[PDB]
Scaffold this active site. Structure first.
Site, mmCIF file in Angstrom:
data_model
loop_
_atom_site.group_PDB
_atom_site.id
_atom_site.type_symbol
_atom_site.label_atom_id
_atom_site.label_comp_id
_atom_site.label_asym_id
_atom_site.label_seq_id
_atom_site.Cartn_x
_atom_site.Cartn_y
_atom_site.Cartn_z
ATOM 1 N N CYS A 1 0.974 -1.196 0.244
ATOM 2 C CA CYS A 1 0.104 0.062 -0.133
ATOM 3 C C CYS A 1 0.847 1.193 0.081
ATOM 4 O O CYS A 1 0.890 2.111 -0.670
ATOM 5 C CB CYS A 1 -0.858 0.180 1.253
ATOM 6 S SG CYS A 1 -0.034 0.456 2.883
ATOM 7 N N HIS A 2 1.809 1.455 0.843
ATOM 8 C CA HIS A 2 2.887 2.543 1.095
ATOM 9 C C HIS A 2 4.194 1.895 1.258
ATOM 10 O O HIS A 2 5.225 2.444 1.846
ATOM 11 C CB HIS A 2 2.249 3.356 2.254
ATOM 12 C CG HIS A 2 0.818 3.502 2.369
ATOM 13 N ND1 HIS A 2 0.221 2.986 3.500
ATOM 14 C CD2 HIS A 2 0.015 3.997 1.496
ATOM 15 C CE1 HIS A 2 -0.939 3.026 3.428
ATOM 16 N NE2 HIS A 2 -1.316 3.758 2.155
ATOM 17 N N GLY A 3 4.180 0.525 0.540
ATOM 18 C CA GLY A 3 5.645 0.085 0.339
ATOM 19 C C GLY A 3 6.504 -0.363 1.664
ATOM 20 O O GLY A 3 7.519 0.461 1.934
#
Ligand SMILES: CCCCCCCCCCCCCCCCCC(=O)OC[C@H](COP(=O)([O-])OCC(O)COP(=O)([O-])OC[C@@H](COC(=O)CCCCCCCCCCCCCCCCC)OC(=O)CCCCCCCCCCCCCCCCC)OC(=O)CCCCCCCCCCCCCCCCC
Ligand SMILES: CCCCCCCCCCCCCCCCCC(=O)OC[C@H](COP(=O)([O-])OCC(O)COP(=O)([O-])OC[C@@H](COC(=O)CCCCCCCCCCCCCCCCC)OC(=O)CCCCCCCCCCCCCCCCC)OC(=O)CCCCCCCCCCCCCCCCC
Ligand SMILES: CCCCCCCCCCCCCCCCCC(=O)OC[C@H](COP(=O)([O-])OCC[N+](C)(C)C)OC(=O)CCCCCCCCCCCCCCCCC
Ligand SMILES: CCCCCCCCCCCCCCCCCC(=O)OC[C@H](COP(=O)([O-])OCC[N+](C)(C)C)OC(=O)CCCCCCCCCCCCCCCCC
Ligand SMILES: CCCCCCCCCCCCCCCCCC(=O)OC[C@H](COP(=O)(O)OCCN)OC(=O)CCCCCCCCCCCCCCCCC
Ligand SMILES: CCCCCCCCCCCCCCCCCC(=O)OC[C@H](COP(=O)(O)OCCN)OC(=O)CCCCCCCCCCCCCCCCC
Ligand SMILES: CCCCCCCCCCCCCCCCCC(=O)OC[C@H](COP(=O)(O)OCCN)OC(=O)CCCCCCCCCCCCCCCCC
Ligand code: HEC
Ligand code: HEM
Ligand code: HEM
Lengths: 379, 98, 65, 54, 237, 56, 52, 74
Positions: D18-20
């Site tokens: 999603c945000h790494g």
């Protein structure tokens, strides 16, 4: 022939309650809040009924039902925000009433004071429970934290959080039981308020001076009805200002989000009227000691009748006690602000210090100041 | 010396403004109401008039004019002997009970 | 089709808050680029550069729309 | 939230795309956007063939 | 973190209201930009009528989309043209499909997005116009994008809107800033539909409070006039 | 003294007093609604779905 | 209060009421164990541990 | 506790007037404003300082938190 006002039983009770009840003439506005609370009770209960007429307590419909009330129901948004800001205003009036009771030595009415403490407890429980009902992210997550605080209780405590949750964690069973208890509790508040009024009416209210006003008493109906009308109107002015111009002012925006148990919110915080005792809970490192301090932060009101030692009941003639009282009020504001903020530097130290100063002022500074007060006046 | 602090506190108290003597401001507990009942007629009448006038003043929120305030040296502890007698009798009864 | 936002942003670039912010950002740029492996990420002074620029913009832009 | 895909995230264990946020293979996180480590439940290892999670 | 500025919105006034033409334009932006990935299920085409569209326009807009609903005589889920009764179409059938489609991230429901983020519209606008290039020393995983306003400094959404990204029905330029303004004010309307009414709710009450307060208080003082003028005299023997 | 005749003709009797309140409520609601609404669209002229519907 | 309860006849009252209050305490403890079905205590007592 | 036997009082003479013969706002501003200033002066020294110390500690806490969030040159 006899007066229907003071011969018919219901009318006789009403007459002795708030028609021909003697009252002190020099009663300031600080007492109006009492009636305001009653108003802020009724204005709540009625609104709650209407909300209960379009609320379906379930983890699949709670947020959707609240949204349906807000948008679709004819004038439903006004009822919803009226309810929320009315609870906030109810707590404003409750805190002001407690401050008045502390200031003017009104805790010398021991029975009324204890019944008021019970009412205050019930109101906090009702509001905490009610904030769950919209089932937002903040509602569910805060509820999880607050109920899990009971796990710190030794032995039985863990089982208790399984009992209150209705299972392993806060779920639909918790939501519906919270709805049912939120329904029932305000009527218990009404009965307790009736008892509180009975106890006060036995002895009569206390004037700001603290001296008995038996020589100068005025009938309640001709004067202290329209004054309370003006007070309730001012309270309505503030409350509809909040509802109609800044509806989601005190409420956290994170509530307007479906309760997802897969994502912890950035900061889990209760209402502004809950942040002070929650900050007290935060201050103490030990979990069980935290809950003990949290409950004591309100239970200490019962100790106030015992801790009074000054020969003057009120505070109009005790300037040092006035400064101490205002220090206490500022300390409570600091507690609320700290509870709003996260537990980081320097908020940790500030919250701890203010938490100590709260109890230190209530238990130590006030009685010692009262002893010095008596010594300073030849007695 | 301490009497300066006492006078400053009397000025900052407030009941001197309201035309009240010191004993008009004391909380009315059981000992105090019994002592008030024990008061002579003239002192009781002056006390009740003073208290009623003070309640009127704080109802209107008008402090009584400057010149006829209760001075420190003119403050008479009228209740004190009766309250001391009441406290002594109560203490004697409690000692007998023990 | 040029944007009102880009020209308002360019005019908001040349005020002294954003001037000092840009100098600090360029200093961090050269510092981090020069050093091979450093966790020091020029995010924060970039945030102050923004906080000056977007405030300057928000004071003017809505009139251009 | 989301779900970390396995056998990824440089260190090797887990990766939330999603945000790494890459995660430590043991269950922790070495670094990344995610604040703290992945939660471990009150599982029980009795009768390894049939392991119950609480 | 970097929070949003305080943009002078046309509805930010104490007794001001949203510009409904901009509401309509922002709704067009929602239809033809983010309706393919974002859902606004809590609102329906019925709410559209009377504030941004007429009944006929709303009907045409509803029938332009196809909604699958109802079991037929054979029980199959049949698709029919949308109507005013239907809510806004959901681009993805189930949330897990949405996450798996984009990157695993979930596009939040746009119905309450403005009322849920601290900052309101000024936040979302700042996000949409805040798409920047990552600063020195910050790496970017291929698939993410850098936005200073988003908590985490890394958003999982490609730049949605830009210049000429759309063609407004009226004819106003479709430049990126104007599109962002219109969509943000439309999202404000969607989040708080009662806004305008609330303002009209307040104004009357305010004028009402300018009339009841000086009266009732006066009445109170009138009823207090007996006590406040009361005079006493002590006449001991 | 207009107030004197007003009181003597329509305020002394509580019944006519209540009639005055009830009747004047009609027209006060009328006038206040109209004035407040007019002020409201005066402050917000052109931004409501009442001054732009002719365009669509 | 403190001193007014600190008397000889008061400790005489305390001595007189120690048995009744103390075994009221036993009444309460037994009632609590009974009501809660406290297995920690009820296990040791005979003929009731069979319920578990 | 009701009117009729509340207490005992003697030699007290009290006067008042009808609400329909005297002004409801007798010089509401001529002595009202001086009274407000008098009460404000009486209570200001004992009310304000507890709130001003809260103001200072709030500002200091906020600024120190902001500074702590900034990086510390390492
Ligand atoms: C949240 C709370 C919501 C509810 C708030 C109100 C609750 C109580 C309302 C009823 C009440 O207590 O009425 C009496 C209470 C005080 O007595 P009063 O009615 O002013 O009567 C004259 C005073 O006793 C003594 O008057 P004075 O000698 O000081 O002179 C007149 C005036 C001061 O003179 C002025 O001109 C005022 C300053 C300008 O005094 C005032 O207190 C004016 C207050 C209003 C301005 O009324 C008010 O305070 C006015 C309404 C409340 C205004 C806001 C107060 C803060
Ligand atoms: C201008 C500079 C003064 C601003 C007000 C602060 C101040 O010094 O007040 C002095 C004084 C309050 O202190 P005080 O006279 O020593 O005690 C009066 C009692 O508290 C009894 O006061 P009362 O109930 O007769 O009327 C005043 C009361 C009435 O309060 C309420 O009705 C509830 C709402 C306020 C809480 O509100 C306050 O005492 C709050 C004062 C600060 C907010 C205004 O208030 C006034 O002289 C006027 C208040 C209304 C101004 C409009
Ligand atoms: C919840 C708690 C209340 C919260 C809001 C508080 C503020 C608003 C309510 C109170 C406002 C002030 C009092 C209003 C009523 C009043 O004046 O009562 C005393 C007044 C009396 O005031 P008065 O005594 O000065 O005038 C009457 C005396 N003569 C006749 C000689 C002039 O009551 C009445 O006037 C009653 C009249 C009959 C009943 C009402 C008739 C009109 C009904 C209209 C609705 C349609 C049916
Ligand atoms: C309080 C002490 C008596 C209740 C108790 O602890 O257990 C009672 C009985 C028997 O408990 P038990 O003996 O089966 O187990 C005791 C240990 N806990 C409580 C952690 C499971 O349990 C209950 O009534 C439920 C626990 C909460 C009681 C309130
Ligand atoms: C409120 C702010 C205004 C204020 O407090 O003004 C001072 C006023 C003075 O009251 P008075 O009894 O006339 O003082 C005589 C002094 N010689 O009033 C006082 O000093 C008393 C005010 C406090 C008592 C009433 C409670 C009001 C709410 C205070 C905050 C409570 C917060 C929660 C506390 C628990
Ligand atoms: C007395 C204290 C409560 C009332 C305060 C003043 C209310 C004034 C009022 O009624 O204003 C009108 C407004 C509703 O206006 P509107 O939505 O146009 O409906 C038709 C109105 N003729 O209504 C309002 O502005 C407020 C009334 C509705 C909200 C409930 C208020 C009581 C709780
Ligand atoms: C703060 C001051 C204002 C408070 C709110 C006033 C509302 C209207 C009050 C009113 O009806 O009259 C106010 C004022 C004085 O009224 P009153 O003291 O009754 O004397 C009447 C004869 N001159 O009389 C007037 O204003 C003029 C009335 C004609
Ligand atoms: C093709 C995909 C796609 C398009 C087009 C798109 N988004 Fe998103 N959006 C996402 C995804 C995926 C996320 C999740 C990122 C986080 O995590 C997201 C996140 C968001 C958030 C959450 C930010 C926050 O934390 O509050 C908002 C608001 C948002 N989008 C609004 C919009 C608006 C307004 C538009 C267009 C006018 C738009 N999006 C266009 C896919 C898209
Ligand atoms: C003692 C007075 C009361 C208080 C303090 C109180 C408090 C609250 C609060 C704080 C909320 C959450 C508001 C929000 O969503 O932000 C709430 C919700 C609710 N309350 Fe109450 N309440 C009271 C009385 C009642 C009563 C008597 C009923 C039932 C008749 C009721 C029914 C509800 C319902 C159905 C909700 C959910 C709707 C909503 O959250 O808006 N309340 N209550
Ligand atoms: C449910 C909310 C409450 C209601 C409806 C209520 C009702 C009232 C009312 C109407 C009065 C008379 C007016 C007044 O003196 O203010 C009063 C007096 C009083 N109440 Fe409450 N009360 C509530 C909560 C509390 C609380 C929380 C306390 C404190 C523990 C308390 C303690 C008192 C005291 C001490 C008095 C006497 C004040 C005096 O005589 O000067 N009450 N109550």
């Amino acid at each position: 022939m006899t007066n229907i006002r003071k011969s018919h039983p219901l009318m006789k009770i009403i007459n002795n309650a708030f028609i021909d009840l003697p009252a002190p003439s020099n009663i300031s506005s600080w007492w109006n809040f009492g009636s305001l609370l009653g108003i802020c009770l009724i204005l709540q209960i009625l609104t709650g009924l209407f909300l209960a007429m379009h609320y379906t307590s379930d983890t699949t419909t709670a947020f959707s039902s609240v949204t349906h009330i807000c948008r679709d129901v004819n004038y439903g948004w006004v009822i919803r925000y009226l309810h929320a800001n009315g609870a906030s205003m109810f707590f404003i009036c409750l805190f002001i009433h407690v401050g008045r009771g502390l200031y003017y030595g009104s805790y010398m009415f021991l029975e009324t004071w204890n019944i008021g403490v019970v009412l205050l407890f019930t109101v906090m429980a009702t509001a905490f429970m009610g904030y769950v009902l919209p089932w937002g992210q903040m509602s569910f997550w805060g509820a999880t934290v607050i109920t899990n605080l009971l796990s710190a209780i030794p032995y039985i405590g863990t089982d208790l959080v399984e009992w209150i949750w209705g299972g392993f964690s806060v779920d639909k069973a918790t939501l519906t039981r919270f709805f049912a208890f939120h329904f029932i509790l305000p009527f218990i508040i009404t009965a307790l308020a009736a008892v509180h009024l009975l106890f006060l009416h036995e002895t009569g209210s206390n004037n700001p001076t603290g001296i008995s006003s038996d020589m100068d008493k005025i009938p309640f109906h001709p004067y202290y009805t329209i004054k309370d009308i003006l007070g309730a109107l001012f309270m309505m002015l503030i409350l509809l200002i909040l509802v109609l111009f800044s509806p989601d002012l005190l409420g956290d925006p994170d509530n307007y989000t479906p309760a997802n148990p897969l994502n912890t919110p950035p900061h889990i915080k209760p209402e502004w009227y809950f942040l002070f005792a929650y900050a007290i809970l935060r201050s103490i490192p030990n979990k069980l000691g935290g809950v003990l301090a949290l409950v004591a932060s309100i239970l200490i009101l019962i100790l106030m009748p015992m801790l009074h030692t000054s020969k003057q009941r009120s505070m109009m003639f005790r300037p040092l006690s006035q400064c101490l009282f205002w220090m206490l009020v500022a300390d409570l504001i600091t507690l609320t602000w700290i509870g709003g903020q996260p537990v980081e530097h320097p908020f940790i130290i500030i919250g701890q210090l203010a938490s100590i100063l709260y109890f230190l002022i209530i238990l130590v500074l006030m009685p010692i100041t009262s002893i010095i007060e008596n010594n300073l006046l030849k007695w | 010396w301490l009497e300066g602090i006492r006078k400053w506190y009397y000025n900052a108290a407030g009941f001197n403004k309201l035309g009240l003597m010191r004993d008009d401001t004391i909380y009315e507990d059981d000992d105090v109401k019994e002592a008030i009942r024990r008061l002579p007629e003239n002192l009781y009448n002056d006390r009740v008039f003073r208290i009623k006038r003070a309640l009127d003043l704080t109802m209107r929120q008008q402090i009584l004019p400057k010149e006829q305030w209760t001075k420190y040296e003119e403050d008479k502890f009228y209740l004190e002997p009766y309250l001391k007698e009441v406290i002594r009798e109560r203490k004697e009864r409690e000692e007998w009970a023990k | 089709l040029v944007d009102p936002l880009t020209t308002v942003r360019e005019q908001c670039e040349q005020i002294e808050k954003c001037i000092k912010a840009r100098e600090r950002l360029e200093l961090c740029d050269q510092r981090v680029s020069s050093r091979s492996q450093t966790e020091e990420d020029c995010t924060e002074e970039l945030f102050d550069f923004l906080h000056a620029r977007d405030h300057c913009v928000a004071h003017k832009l809505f009139n251009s729309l | 939230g989301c779900v970390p895909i396995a056998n990824a995230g440089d260190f090797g264990g887990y990766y939330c795309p999603c945000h790494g946020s890459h995660y430590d293979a043991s269950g922790r996180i070495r670094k990344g956007p995610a604040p703290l480590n992945l939660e471990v439940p009150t599982y029980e290892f009795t009768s390894d063939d049939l392991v119950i999670v609480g | 973190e970097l929070h949003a500025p305080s943009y002078p919105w046309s509805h930010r006034g104490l007794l001001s209201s949203l510009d409904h033409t901009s509401i309509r334009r922002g709704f067009q932006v929602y239809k033809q930009v983010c309706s393919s990935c974002h859902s606004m299920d809590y609102v329906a085409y019925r709410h559209l009528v009377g504030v941004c569209y007429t009944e006929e326009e709303a009907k045409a807009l509803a029938e332009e989309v196809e909604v699958q609903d109802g079991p037929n005589e054979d029980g199959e889920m049949f698709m029919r043209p949308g109507k005013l009764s239907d809510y806004f179409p959901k681009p993805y059938p189930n949330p897990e499909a949405a996450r798996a489609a984009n990157n695993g991230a979930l596009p939040p429901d746009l119905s309450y997005i403005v009322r849920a983020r601290h900052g309101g519209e000024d936040y979302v606008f700042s996000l949409l116009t805040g798409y920047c290039e990552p600063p020195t020393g910050v790496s970017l995983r291929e698939g993410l994008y850098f936005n200073p306003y988003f908590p985490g400094q890394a958003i999982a959404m490609a730049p949605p809107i830009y210049n000429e990204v759309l063609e407004f029905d009226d004819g106003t330029p479709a430049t990126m800033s104007q599109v962002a303004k219109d969509v943000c004010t439309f999202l404000r309307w969607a989040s708080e539909p009662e806004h305008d009414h609330r303002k009209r709710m307040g104004l009357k009450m305010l004028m009402m409070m300018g009339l009841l307060l000086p009266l009732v208080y006066a009445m109170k003082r009138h009823k207090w006039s007996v006590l406040k003028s009361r005079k006493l005299a002590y006449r001991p023997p | 003294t207009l107030t004197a005749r007003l009181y003597s003709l329509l305020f002394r009797r509580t019944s006519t007093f209540a009639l005055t309140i009830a009747v004047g409520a009609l027209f006060f609601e009328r006038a206040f609604d109209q004035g407040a609404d007019a002020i409201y669209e005066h402050i917000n002229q052109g931004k409501l779905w009442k001054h732009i519907k002719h365009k669509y | 209060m403190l001193s007014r309860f600190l008397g000889p006849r008061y400790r005489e009252l305390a001595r007189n009421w120690i048995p009744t209050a103390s075994m009221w305490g036993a009444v309460g403890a037994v009632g609590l164990v009974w009501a809660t079905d406290w297995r920690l205590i009820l296990d040791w007592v005979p003929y009731i541990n069979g319920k578990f | 506790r009701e009117f009729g036997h509340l207490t005992r009082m003697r030699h007290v003479i009290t006067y008042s007037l009808s609400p329909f013969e005297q002004r409801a706002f007798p010089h509401y501003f001529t002595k009202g404003i001086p009274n407000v200033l008098r009460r404000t002066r009486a209570c200001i020294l004992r009310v304000a300082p507890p709130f001003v110390v809260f103001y200072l500690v709030y500002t200091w806490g906020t600024q120190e938190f902001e500074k702590s969030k900034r990086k510390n040159p390492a």
